Amino acid sequence: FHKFTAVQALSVIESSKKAQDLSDDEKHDNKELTRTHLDDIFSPFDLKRLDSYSNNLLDYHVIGDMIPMLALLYFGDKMSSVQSAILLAIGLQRKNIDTIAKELNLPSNQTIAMFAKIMRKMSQYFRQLLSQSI
């Protein structure tokens, strides 16, 4: 919220320019966390893992699970694939504007909600793969 009124498509352009600059200099000698299970259990609690997996594999509220809607989008940004639609929804959530605010902007409310449910379900599969692999 250092700006808080910057644009989401401009944010996708900024993430694209940062990603091209970080991916093509010669080769990126700065690795991220490739499924560290203790680090995942340290950043998000086991209550957070059970809560995200419950809201994925069942129906809970996005407003009842939005505590993991801040750091997980940044984790998908830095450290899985999210095309620039779900990436723009996650960028609006990272700018902390509402899902209604990005949804009545781009597509529709249930549209952007089901797209973010798809993104959180893929992130739930990623954390499930890490927590099962260690």
User: Residue 39 binds which one of another protein, its own copies, none, with CB within 5 to 8 A depending on kind?
Assistant: its own copies
Q: Which residues inside 74-103 make contact with its own copies, applying CB under 8 A? A: 96-97
Q: Is residue 1 at the binding interface for its own copies, with CB under 8 A as the rule? A: yes
- Which residue stretch of 42-50, 54-62, 81-89, 122-130 sits at the interface with another protein (rule: CB under 8 A)? 54-62
Long-range contacts of 25-31 (CB under 8 A, 24+ apart): none
Largest CA distance in the chain: 45
Contact 83, 107 (CB under 8 A): no
CA distances from 20 to 24, 85, 131 (A): 6, 18, 31
Q: Pick from 10, 19, 114, 134: which binds another protein (CB under 8 A)? A: 114
Q: Around 35, how many Cα atoms within 13 Å sit in the side-chain half-sphere?
A: 13
List 22, 28, 64, 109, residue binding its own copies (CB under 8 A): 64
118 contributes a contact to its own copies by CB under 8 A: no
Name, in order, each residue with C-beta under 8 angstroms of 75's C-beta and a sequence gap of 6 or more. 123
110 lies in the site for its own copies, by CB under 8 A: no
Q: Does 42 bind its own copies (CB under 8 A)?
A: yes
Q: Does 63 engage in binding with another protein (CB under 8 A)?
A: no
Contact 130, 40 (CB under 8 A): yes
Nearest to its own copies of 3, 31 (CB atom): 3
CA distance 130 to 112: 27
> Contacts with another protein: how many residues (CB under 8 A)?
6
Binding residues vs another protein (CB under 8 A): 58-61, 110, 114
